[PDB]
Amino acid sequence: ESADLRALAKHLYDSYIKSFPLTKAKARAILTGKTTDKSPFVIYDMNSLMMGEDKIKFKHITPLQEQSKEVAIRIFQGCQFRSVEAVQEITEYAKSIPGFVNLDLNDQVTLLKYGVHEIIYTMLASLMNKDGVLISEGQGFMTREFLKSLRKPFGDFMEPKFEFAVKFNALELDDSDLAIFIAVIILSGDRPGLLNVKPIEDIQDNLLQALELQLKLNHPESSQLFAKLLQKMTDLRQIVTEHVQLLQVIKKTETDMSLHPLLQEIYKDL
Amino acid sequence: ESADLRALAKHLYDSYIKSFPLTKAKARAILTGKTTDKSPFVIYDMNSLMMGEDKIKFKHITPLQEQSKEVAIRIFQGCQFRSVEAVQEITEYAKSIPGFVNLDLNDQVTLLKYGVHEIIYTMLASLMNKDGVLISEGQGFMTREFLKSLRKPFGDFMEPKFEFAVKFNALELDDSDLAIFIAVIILSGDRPGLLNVKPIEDIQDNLLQALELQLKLNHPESSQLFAKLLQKMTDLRQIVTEHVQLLQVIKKTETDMSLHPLLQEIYKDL
Numbered sequence: 447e448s449a450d451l452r453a454l455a456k457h458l459y460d461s462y463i464k465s466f467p468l469t470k471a472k473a474r475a476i477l478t479g480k481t482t483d484k485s486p487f488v489i490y491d492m493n494s495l496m497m498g499e500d501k502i503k504f505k506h507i508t509p510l511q512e513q514s515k516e517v518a519i520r521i522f523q524g525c526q527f528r529s530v531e532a533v534q535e536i537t538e539y540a541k542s543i544p545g546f547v548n549l550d551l552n553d554q555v556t557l558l559k560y561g562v563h564e565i566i567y568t569m570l571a572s573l574m575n576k577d578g579v580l581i582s583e584g585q586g587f588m589t590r591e592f593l594k595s596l597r598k599p600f601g602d603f604m605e606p607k608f609e610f611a612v613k614f615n616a617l618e619l620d621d622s623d624l625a626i627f628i629a630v631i632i633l634s635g636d637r638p639g640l641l642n643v644k645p646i647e648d649i650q651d652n653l654l655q656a657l658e659l660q661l662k663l664n665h666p667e668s669s670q671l672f673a674k675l676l677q678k679m680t681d682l683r684q685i686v687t688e689h690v691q692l693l694q695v696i697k698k699t700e701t702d703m704s705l706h707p708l709l710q711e712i713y714k715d716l
Numbered sequence: 717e718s719a720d721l722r723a724l725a726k727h728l729y730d731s732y733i734k735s736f737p738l739t740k741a742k743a744r745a746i747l748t749g750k751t752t753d754k755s756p757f758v759i760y761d762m763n764s765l766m767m768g769e770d771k772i773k774f775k776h777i778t779p780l781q782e783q784s785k786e787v788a789i790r791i792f793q794g795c796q797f798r799s800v801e802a803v804q805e806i807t808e809y810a811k812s813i814p815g816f817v818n819l820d821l822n823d824q825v826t827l828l829k830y831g832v833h834e835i836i837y838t839m840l841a842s843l844m845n846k847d848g849v850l851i852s853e854g855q856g857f858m859t860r861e862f863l864k865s866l867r868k869p870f871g872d873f874m875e876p877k878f879e880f881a882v883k884f885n886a887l888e889l890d891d892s893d894l895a896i897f898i899a900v901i902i903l904s905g906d907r908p909g910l911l912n913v914k915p916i917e918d919i920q921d922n923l924l925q926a927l928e929l930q931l932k933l934n935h936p937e938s939s940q941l942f943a944k945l946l947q948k949m950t951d952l953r954q955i956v957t958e959h960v961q962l963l964q965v966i967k968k969t970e971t972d973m974s975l976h977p978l979l980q981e982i983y984k985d986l
């Protein structure tokens with residue numbers, strides 16, 4: 447019954463809101479949008495980052511650039527720290543999807559382990575436009591130029607994601623849409639190692655049917671949007687693969703450090 | 717609302733099952749012969765230790781050890797592998813603790829630094845009974861007596877732990893109890909160096925509430941179990957202290973032995 451689906455959509459959207467601080471709606475306002483009442487700190491130059499890191503509420507290290515701890519590394523690493531905060535936010539959202547917590551615990555871990563990078567880049571698009579990405583809960587903004595002028599390995603790191611974001615955002619989906627989409631992603635069924643695929647695809651079939659109605663009733667003039675969104679799952683996958691790549695290329699720049707034992711432990715890969 | 721607390725417990729118990737391969741429940745089932753689906757091989761001497769490499773999965777030496785890392789040394793270098801292994805896990809259990817990742821990076825490291833061994837000795841009791849302790853995921857069982865008859869120094873490492881366990885297991889706590897206690901231990905606040913404290917103590921306060929409800933519901937007839945358990949935290953501190961000084965003696969009577977990096981970094985003095 448359509449009523450059942452409309453119901454599931456509201457539940458998912460409700461949890462999403464509770465589970466994620468910065469929403470796309472909220473992020474869109476700060477961005478190009480006006481809603482000027484608390485403008486962000488633009489970081490466009492080396493001095494911009496320096497002369498504005500002792501004022502930002504970012505957790506990692508104080509601004510110090512003088513032949514000690516490079517900016518390129520402090521930025522990449524700072525990106526991991528946040529990515530890990532996000533994972534707890536996603537794990538909590540997964541537990542809100544009907545049927546999820548009832549599945550074999552091992553499969554739950556398997557589903558979260560492989561679905562997390564896909565969710566992260568999906569939501570990273572909500573905070574990006576063609577000129578840059580919002581930073582620190584939206585308190586600041588880091589231009590796309592500065593990022594492209596970083597170290598050799600780190601210069602081509604966030605460019606493929608800027609490209610994905612631009613095309614992805616062309617779809618003009620809103621938080622209520624993203625909520626269901628993100629759930630479809632988690633309830634895949636082709637993840638390696640699953641022990642009992644049946645219930646997983648059963649739940650996903652239900653989420654897919656909800657997504658179809660959510661898009662048809664929320665974007666009436668946007669024909670076949672359902673199909674267009676599912677096709678994006680191809681780009682995301684490439685984005686995730688291509689990412690583990692450069693990542694390994696970095697795993698050969700900085701490693702053996704007797705000061706990062708318990709810290710590097712908390713930041714494996716995902 | 718006692719509803720949210722119950723929900724927090726459920727959460728924690730769930731991540732607990734997901735981070736530890738050998739739960740107390742599996743352990744007791746193995747320790748009580750009632751279930752011979754897979755009984756352990758017993759180690760109470762050199763012969764049985766020799767026959768040990770056989771069925772059990774050991775990559776160490778099997779034959780003589782007098783001229784190739786004596787037995788005592790053989791036992792403890794493996795023990796060392798288990799600790800780093802436990803830390804990596806506890807480290808993983810931590811990230812799932814609501815709020816732990818949102819804290820100051822420096823403090824996170826401080827929290828894991830002082831809590832890790834206290835947790836290991838808490839969980840290590842799930843594998844001991846008056847007579848000994850399970851080894852290699854439960855496939856083996858090493859005699860308390862054998863362990864105590866080890867060379868002058870090494871033979872003092874485990875005894876104090878057995879004493880803690882005998883009394884601690886008296887409490888008859890189950891896996892869903894240990895999960896919350898384990899969390900209350902990490903989020904201390906009275907730990908040295910903590911840049912902050914209020915954020916840290918807000919989370920523990922919440923954990924303590926959940927543990928308090930769990931014990932009541934789960935152990936209705938056990939008077940003052942909450943308080944009794946917290947008093948146990950005192951016994952852990954001492955144990956960590958006798959352990960450290962012992963560790964220091966080995967560092968001097970064996971210039972050949974080397975304490976793993978991830979363990980040397982955690983350890984300190986005074």
Ligand SMILES: O=C(O)[C@H](Cc1ccccc1)Oc1ccc(CCc2ccccc2)cc1
Pocket residue numbers: 788789790792793795796798799836840873959963966972973974975979
């Ligand atoms: O302090 C630790 O992190 C571990 C904690 C522990 C102890 C017992 C069971 C599980 C975990 O206990 C020890 C004690 C001694 C050692 C010595 C390691 C060693 C032995 C022989 C040769 C070289 C190094 C390592 C770990």
